[PDB]
Design a protein around this ligand. Structure first.
Ligand code: CL
Ligand code: CL
Ligand code: CL
Length: 229
């Protein structure tokens, strides 16, 4: 049983995230639900107090294996199981600061657990990340290409909406590496349309978010794959 056969829905998730921003250490945990392919939620909370940064910027740190792929594109993230993968991210909030994350995953009993670390240094203490002035991030197309002999690379430029209705840009670059000691067939170059929506739970007393991601792959530019050898 491997690959897509391991991702029979519904499934769940957990996260444990240890973070630090501008020397403020924090932890987040969460549980989530994946009802069906490409629709996945996460109810996360800060276990150390209030989260010391925007929940909108931490959105993308907070599960590409749940993306919905058509049959005619390899779902590299799912095909890494069994064995799993690592994700390494850099997110540059342009004119603000840069953060990195590292993710490890494990699958047990229909539940993907993410263990994540986040590090962020040099942020503007008056910027939107640290003052919590973002409302949401706009939907975007992540570009996925083969990377090295055994990985993939994911890139996106994300528009973050501030409370005054103007935009700040984050540039995001991720590398995915199988850790399972085996070659996983790389996909053709493609794109993943991604949308995050966040809301608050009516009752939860913790600093928290209830986030849903919708993520759908597609060969949006059929000529792109020619460019990546
Ligand atoms: Cl926030
Ligand atoms: Cl990403
Ligand atoms: Cl493919």
């Amino acid at each position: 049983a491997s690959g897509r056969a391991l991702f029979q829905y519904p499934m769940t998730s957990k996260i444990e995230l240890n973070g630090e921003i501008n020397g403020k250490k924090f932890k987040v945990a969460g549980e989530g639900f994946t009802p069906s392919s490409g629709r996945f939620n996460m109810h996360a909370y800060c276990t150390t107090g209030d989260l010391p940064m925007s929940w909108v910027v931490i959105a993308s740190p907070l599960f590409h294996m749940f993306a919905h792929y058509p049959e005619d594109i390899t779902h590299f993230f799912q095909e890494c199981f069994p064995g799993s993968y690592t994700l390494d991210r850099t997110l540059r909030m342009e004119g603000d600061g840069t953060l990195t994350t590292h993710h490890e995953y494990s699958l047990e009993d229909g539940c993907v657990t993410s263990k994540t670390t986040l590090n962020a240094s040099g942020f503007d203490p008056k910027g939107a990340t640290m003052t919590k002035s973002f409302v949401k991030q706009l939907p975007n197309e992540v570009k996925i290409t083969p990377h090295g002999p055994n990985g993939i690379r994911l890139t996106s430029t994300v528009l973050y909406l501030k409370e005054d209705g103007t935009i700040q840009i984050g540039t995001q670059d991720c590398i995915v590496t199988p850790v399972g000691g085996r070659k996983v067939t790389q996909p053709k170059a493609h794109f993943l349309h991604t949308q995050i929506i966040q809301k608050k739970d009516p009752n939860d007393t913790r600093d928290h978010i209830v986030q849903t991601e919708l993520a759908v792959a597609g060969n949006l530019w059929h000529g792109m794959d020619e460019l990546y050898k």
